[PDB]
C-alpha cells in the first residue's frame, strides 16, 4: 500500500516501497508530520526506492515514516474559484479566506502544446511605455522577457505592466511569484486589493487575478514547481475557459536556481558554471507550455534576473531563445537616473519588422537605435577631446541622442510613491510622432533636460515653459519672504509651546506578557524505550 522514508538528505527524501512503485512526477503525502509535507517523485533509485523532492521542510522526518502514494501528480484547484485567491505550490489557500471552491482540480504536469496548434498572428500589445512600445514592441499572445540584474527595476516594470495591461485587458491574469521577496508579494496583493483587481468576500467572483506564490523562504522543491502551478492555472484559463490570459512570472530565474539546489542531491554531476545538466530541457519543458494555442491565448511577461549583470550566464542565456520580445534592463542606464532603465539597443522584439508594425514605426525605431549607437561610438572621443571640434554633424547627433535618451524615460504610476512625479501613459501613435520630431529635428530649440521624466511630446514643450519660468525666478533677494517674522509666523519659542508632550515608561513592557518557563541546567535525553531520562554520567 504505502512506502516508508529511507533517507533524508536536505530537501531530498528517499522513499522505499515494497512493490508497486509510484510513477515519476507523482505526488506523495507524508503522514505523521506536523505540517502537510508533499513529496514529488524525481527518479527511481532502483532497489524499490524512489528519490523525491519535498514541497515543504524536511525537518522532522523519521527513517521509516509512512509515506502514502496519491497515484497522481500535484493537483491544484483551477477555475473561477481561484480568481482573487493566493495559492501555494500545492494549491492551498494562504490568503486565510476559506477553502478554494474551484471544480476540476488539475495536475501541474502536462506536456507542451504540439506543433499544429500554434498561432502565427502578430498583433502589438500596447503598454503605454514609450521605450517598450517604440523600440521593442510587445506582442499580444506572446512571451516577454524582462532581463536585468538586482535593483534595476524588474519588479517596478512588471508592476507597471500589470497596472497598464491587466486592468484594461478583460480576461484573467495569473501572477506567479517564483522565489521572490514575500514583502513585495504582499505589496502586489495590497495594491490589487485597492485597485479592484482582487475583491474579497461575496464579490470575490468579480476578481481578475489569481496569485500563486513560491517565495524565497520556501524550500527549493516549492520554488521549482510553483511556476507549474501558476502555469496550470493559466492553462485552464486558456484551454477550457477559452479566455486570453496574462501570466506574469516574477523571476523565472528562480525556477532554474531551485532546480540547481537539488540536482547534486539527485545524483547529477554538475554542468557548466554550477547549474544542473538538465537546465535547457527543464526550462524548455516549462516554457513551451506557455504558448498561444488555437483554443486560447497566454500573454506571458517574465522577469529574468541576470546574475551580477551577466547576460552570458547560462540561466538567462537559455531563457533568451524562448521569448518573442526581450526588455533588457541595464544598470548603467539606471546610473544616469533614466527610468525605466531599458537598454535601447540590447532590447529586441519579433514585432520590430516593417511588415508588422508599419514602415513609419519601424523606421523611426531604427533611426533612434542608429543615433544612439552613433552617440555610443562618440562617447569614447568625447572623454578625450571634449566635444568641441566635431564640425556640427557629430555635435548635432550627440544632442539629438541625448534628447532621445532623456525622452525614453517615463514616470510610472507605480513609482509615484518613491519619486513623487505622477505617472504617464503614452500611446503608440503618440510616441512615434514624438520620437520622429526629435529625430528629424523639430525640437532642437527645446532645452536638453526638458525631455526628462515626461509623457508625451506635449509635455517637454511645457517643461520647457516651466524651466524658463523657474530660471526667470531666483533673480531678486532684498526682503519680503517667509524669514521676516512680521507676516504670520510666531516666535521660535512659541512654536515649541505647540508641541504635545509624549509619555515615557522606562520599563519597556517585558514583565507582564511573557511565559517565563524553566529550562533545566542538565541535559535531558531519551533512552532505548523512549522514556525521558537525564544524561547518564558515564562517558
Amino acid at each position: 500500500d504505502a512506502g516508508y522514508v529511507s533517507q533524508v538528505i536536505g530537501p531530498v527524501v528517499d522513499v522505499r516501497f515494497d512493490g508497486e512503485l509510484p510513477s515519476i512526477l507523482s505526488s506523495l503525502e507524508v503522514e505523521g508530520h506536523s505540517v502537510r509535507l508533499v513529496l514529488e517523485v524525481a527518479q527511481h533509485m532502483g532497489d524499490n526506492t524512489v528519490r523525491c523532492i519535498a514541497m515543504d521542510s524536511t525537518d522532522g522526518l523519521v527513517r521509516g515514516q509512512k509515506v502514502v502514494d496519491t497515484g497522481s501528480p500535484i493537483k491544484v484547484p483551477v477555475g473561477r474559484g481561484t480568481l482573487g485567491r493566493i495559492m501555494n505550490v500545492i494549491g492551498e489557500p494562504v490568503d486565510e479566506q476559506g477553502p478554494i471552491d474551484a471544480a476540476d482540480i488539475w495536475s501541474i504536469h502536462r506536456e507542451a502544446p504540439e506543433f499544429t496548434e500554434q498561432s502565427t498572428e502578430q498583433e502589438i500589445l500596447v503598454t503605454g511605455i514609450k521605450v517598450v512600445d517604440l523600440l521593442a514592441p510587445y506582442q499580444r499572445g506572446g512571451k516577454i522577457g524582462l532581463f536585468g540584474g538586482a535593483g534595476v527595476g524588474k519588479t517596478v516594470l512588471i508592476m507597471e505592466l500589470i497596472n497598464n495591461v491587466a486592468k484594461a485587458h478583460g480576461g484573467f491574469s495569473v501572477f506567479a511569484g517564483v522565489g521572490e521577496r514575500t514583502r513585495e508579494g504582499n505589496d502586489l496583493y495590497r495594491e490589487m486589493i485597492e485597485s479592484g483587481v482582487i475583491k474579497l468576500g461575496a464579490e470575490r467572483g468579480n476578481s481578475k487575478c489569481t496569485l500563486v506564490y513560491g517565495q524565497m523562504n520556501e524550500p527549493p522543491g516549492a520554488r521549482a514547481r510553483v511556476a507549474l502551478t501558476g502555469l496550470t492555472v493559466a492553462e485552464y484559463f486558456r484551454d477550457i475557459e477559452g479566455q486570453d490570459v496574462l501570466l506574469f512570472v516574477d523571476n523565472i530565474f528562480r525556477f532554474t536556481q531551485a532546480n540547481s539546489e537539488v540536482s547534486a542531491l539527485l545524483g547529477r554531476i554538475p554542468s557548466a558554471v554550477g547549474y544542473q545538466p538538465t537546465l535547457a530541457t527543464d526550462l524548455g519543458g516549462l516554457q513551451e507550455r506557455i504558448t498561444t494555442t488555437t483554443k486560447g491565448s497566454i500573454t506571458s511577461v517574465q522577469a529574468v534576473y541576470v546574475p551580477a549583470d551577466d547576460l552570458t550566464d547560462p540561466a538567462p542565456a537559455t531563457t533568451f531563445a524562448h521569448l518573442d520580445a526581450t526588455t533588457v534592463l541595464s544598470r548603467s542606464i539606471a546610473e544616469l537616473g533614466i527610468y525605466p532603465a531599458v537598454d535601447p539597443l540590447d532590447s529586441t522584439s519579433r514585432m520590430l519588422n516593417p511588415n508588422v508594425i508599419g514602415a513609419e514605426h519601424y523606421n523611426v525605431a531604427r533611426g533612434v537605435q542608429k543615433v544612439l549607437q552613433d552617440y555610443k561610438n562618440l562617447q569614447d572621443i568625447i572623454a578625450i577631446l571634449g566635444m568641441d571640434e566635431l564640425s556640427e554633424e557629430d555635435k548635432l547627433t550627440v544632442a539629438r541622442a541625448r534628447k532621445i535618451q532623456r525622452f525614453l524615460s517615463q514616470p510610472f504610476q507605480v513609482a509615484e510613491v518613491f519619486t513623487g512625479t505622477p505617472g504617464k501613459y503614452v500611446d503608440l501613435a503618440d510616441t512615434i510622432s514624438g520620437f520622429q520630431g526629435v529625430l528629424t529635428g523639430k525640437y532642437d530649440d527645446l532645452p536638453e533636460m526638458a525631455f526628462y521624466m515626461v509623457g508625451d511630446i506635449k509635455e517637454v514643450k511645457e517643461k520647457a515653459d516651466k524651466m524658463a519660468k523657474d530660471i526667470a525666478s531666483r533673480k531678486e533677494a532684498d526682503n519680503k519672504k517667509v524669514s521676516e517674522e512680521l507676516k504670520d509666523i510666531p516666535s521660535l519659542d512659541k512654536l515649541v509651546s505647540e508641541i504635545k508632550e509624549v509619555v515615557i515608561e522606562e520599563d519597556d513592557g517585558l514583565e507582564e506578557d511573557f511565559k517565563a518557563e524553566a529550562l533545566s541546567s542538565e541535559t535531558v535525553v531519551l533512552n532505548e524505550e523512549g522514556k525521558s531520562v537525564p544524561l547518564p554520567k558515564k562517558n
Binding site: 533517507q7 525537518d59 558554471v273 551580477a308 521660535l492 515649541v496 515615557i504
Partner: protein, 523 residues
C-alpha cells in the same frame, strides 16, 4: 541477480540438515566465549561508527528526526543532519576530540532550540544559547526553535516606520525601513561593522526618548570573528549603555563549524521574540560570508557534492530562509517588526562573487563601501551610485525627504562631471559650479565613528548645504562648518523639527533666519 529469485530464497530449499542441527547447538556456546568483546546492540540509542573533523557517523538512532539535537555520552551536543539508510550524519556542537568509536549517542527529542525572551536582553551568548559572559545562566527566558518559517503574505504589512541609523549618509541617501533587510557590503576594513555599531548606538540614544513601543532591541550576531573583537564590542556597548537593549550572539572562530552556521539562526530566533510580541527588533548578521563558509565546511565533511567555489547547491536557501524572517507584521499579529543588516565581505571589490550576489538578490537595499572612497577621506565610504534601497520614500523622515532629493540629484550631477576632471575647461561656470557644490555635499556627508547623530540634527545639516549657507567656505572645513551649524543654531529648532517630522512653513523661515545668525569659521 534480480530480486525475484532473491525473494525465492526466503522460502526454505535446503533438502538436508547436516549443518543446521549441528551448529545451532554450537553457536550459543561459541558466542558466549566472546561476550566481553561484544558491545550491546543498539536500536533507539546511537553508537559512533566514525568520528572526525566535527562529523560523527552514528549507527542506530532509529527514530531521530532530521535536524534534531542529539547528545553524545561525553556531554557534547550534536545535530542529526543527513539521515542515511545505515547511519546518521551528526555534526558536533563543539570539539569532537571527546567522541570515540563506540560512544553512545542519545536522542534528545528536540529539534534545535535557543532560549528566547527578555532574559537574553543584555547577555553575551554563544551560537547555541548558552551565556558566555560569566554572569550565570539565563533567567526569565523560554526555549524556541531556530527553524521558524518566515511570516507569509497575509501576516505582513507595508514598511512605513523609519528606524533611523544615526549615519547621515545612510539616513539621507539609503533610508532604512523598520522591517527592511539592508545589506552592508564591502571589502575588508571598509567600515561595515562601524555602520552596524553606530546603528545600535543610535537605537540606544532613541530608546530613551520614544514611548515604549517604537523602542528598538538590537541583536548582534558575530559569526567567525575573533573573541577580542567581540569583547571590545561588549566593552563599547557597556560603556555607552547600549547593552541594555542589545543581545550579542557570539560564535567565534574557535567555535565549531555548526555553531557558526547556527548562530545567525540563533540570533534571528532571539530577535523574533520582539517581532512577535509587538516590539521592534534590529538584527545584524555580521560576517554572513563566514556563516556561508562554516556551512560549506559542514556540508563538505558530510560528503555532499560541492558547487560554485565548492559551496553547497542550497547555499542560497541558507540565507534566503534566514533573511526572509525579517518582516513587518500586520496589526492582528502585533505590528512588530524586525530589520536585518547582513554583512558580506567581498574580495578586492568583486561584487560578482557567489554569496555576495545571492545576498544582494535576497535583501531589499544595499550599502556599498568602497576602499577607494575610504582612503579619500569619505567616511563612511558609501558608494552613492551603487547603494540602493527599495523603499525610498515612505520610510524616512518627512523633513529629510524634502531635503535629500536635492542631495540625491546633485550628487548625481557631481558624479557625471567628475569623470572629466583631467582637463579643467570649467564649461560656462556650470560644470565648475556643480562640482563645487558636490564636493561640499560629499564633505558634508562625512562623520566620525561611534558618534551617531539624531535625525533632526542631520536634516538641519543637509538643509545648510542643499540651500546656500555654505557656498562661502572651502571644502576643507565643512566638517567643522557643520559642527558650527549644529552647535550655534538654537536647539529649539531641533525640538520643533522632531515633533513635526517635516519642516512647517513657520520652521523653514526660522531655519533660514538662524543659518545667517551663526558665525561659521570658514574663510
Amino acid at each position: 541477480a534480480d530480486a525475484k529469485a532473491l525473494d525465492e530464497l526466503r522460502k526454505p530449499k535446503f533438502s538436508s540438515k547436516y549443518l543446521i542441527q549441528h551448529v545451532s547447538q554450537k553457536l550459543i556456546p561459541a558466542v558466549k566465549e566472546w561476550e566481553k568483546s561484544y558491545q550491546p546492540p543498539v536500536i533507539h540509542l546511537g553508537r559512533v561508527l566514525s568520528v572526525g573533523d566535527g562529523i560523527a557517523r552514528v549507527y542506530g538512532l532509529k527514530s531521530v528526526q532530521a535536524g534534531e539535537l542529539v547528545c553524545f555520552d561525553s556531554g557534547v551536543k550534536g545535530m542529526a543532519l543527513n539521515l542515511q539508510a545505515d547511519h546518521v550524519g551528526v555534526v558536533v556542537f563543539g570539539n569532537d576530540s571527546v567522541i570515540h568509536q563506540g560512544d553512545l549517542v542519545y536522542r534528545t527529542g528536540q529539534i534545535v532550540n535557543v532560549p528566547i525572551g527578555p532574559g537574553t536582553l543584555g547577555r553575551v551568548t554563544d551560537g547555541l544559547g548558552q551565556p558566555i559572559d560569566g554572569k550565570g545562566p539565563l533567567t526569565n527566558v523560554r526555549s524556541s526553535l531556530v527553524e521558524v518559517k518566515a511570516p507569509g503574505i497575509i501576516a505582513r504589512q507595508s514598511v512605513r516606520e523609519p528606524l533611523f541609523t544615526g549615519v547621515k549618509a545612510v539616513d539621507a541617501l539609503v533610508p532604512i525601513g523598520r522591517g527592511q533587510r539592508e545589506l552592508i557590503i564591502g571589502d575588508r576594513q571598509t567600515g561595515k561593522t562601524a555602520v552596524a555599531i553606530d546603528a545600535i548606538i543610535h537605537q540606544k540614544n532613541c530608546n530613551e526618548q520614544v514611548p515604549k513601543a517604537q523602542r528598538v532591541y538590537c541583536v548582534y550576531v558575530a559569526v567567525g570573528q575573533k573573541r577580542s573583537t567581540v569583547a571590545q564590542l561588549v566593552k563599547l556597548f557597556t560603556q555607552t549603555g547600549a547593552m541594555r537593549y542589545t543581545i550579542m550572539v557570539s560564535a567565534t572562530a574557535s567555535d565549531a563549524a555548526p555553531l557558526q552556521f547556527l548562530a545567525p539562526y540563533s540570533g534571528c530566533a532571539m530577535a523574533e521574540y520582539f517581532r512577535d510580541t509587538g516590539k521592534h527588533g534590529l538584527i545584524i548578521y555580521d560576517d554572513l560570508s563566514k556563516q556561508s563558509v562554516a556551512y560549506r565546511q559542514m556540508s563538505l565533511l558530510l560528503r555532499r557534492p560541492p558547487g560554485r567555489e565548492a559551496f553547497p547547491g542550497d547555499v542560497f536557501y541558507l540565507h534566503s530562509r534566514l533573511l526572509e524572517r525579517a518582516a513587518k507584521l500586520s496589526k492582528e499579529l502585533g505590528g512588530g517588526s524586525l530589520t536585518a543588516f547582513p554583512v558580506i565581505e567581498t574580495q578586492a571589490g568583486d561584487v560578482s562573487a557567489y554569496i555576495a550576489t545571492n545576498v544582494i538578490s535576497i535583501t531589499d537595499g544595499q550599502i556599498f563601501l568602497e576602499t577607494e572612497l575610504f582612503y579619500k577621506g569619505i567616511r563612511p565610504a558609501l558608494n552613492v551610485g551603487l547603494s540602493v534601497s527599495r523603499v525610498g520614500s515612505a520610510a524616512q523622515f518627512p523633513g529629510m525627504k524634502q531635503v535629500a532629493g536635492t542631495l540625491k540629484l546633485e550628487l548625481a550631477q557631481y558624479r557625471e562631471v567628475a569623470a572629466f576632471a583631467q582637463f579643467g575647461s570649467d564649461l560656462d561656470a556650470a560644470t565648475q559650479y556643480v562640482l563645487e557644490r558636490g564636493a561640499r555635499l560629499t564633505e558634508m556627508l562625512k562623520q566620525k565613528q561611534f558618534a551617531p547623530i539624531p535625525i533632526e540634527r542631520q536634516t538641519v545639516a543637509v538643509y545648510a548645504a542643499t540651500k546656500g549657507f555654505l557656498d562661502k567656505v572651502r571644502v576643507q572645513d565643512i566638517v567643522a562648518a557643520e559642527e558650527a551649524v549644529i552647535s550655534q543654531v538654537n536647539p529649539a529648532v531641533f525640538k520643533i523639527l522632531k515633533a513635526n517630522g517635516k519642516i512647517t512653513p513657520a520652521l523653514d523661515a526660522h531655519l533660514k533666519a538662524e543659518l545667517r545668525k551663526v558665525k561659521l569659521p570658514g574663510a
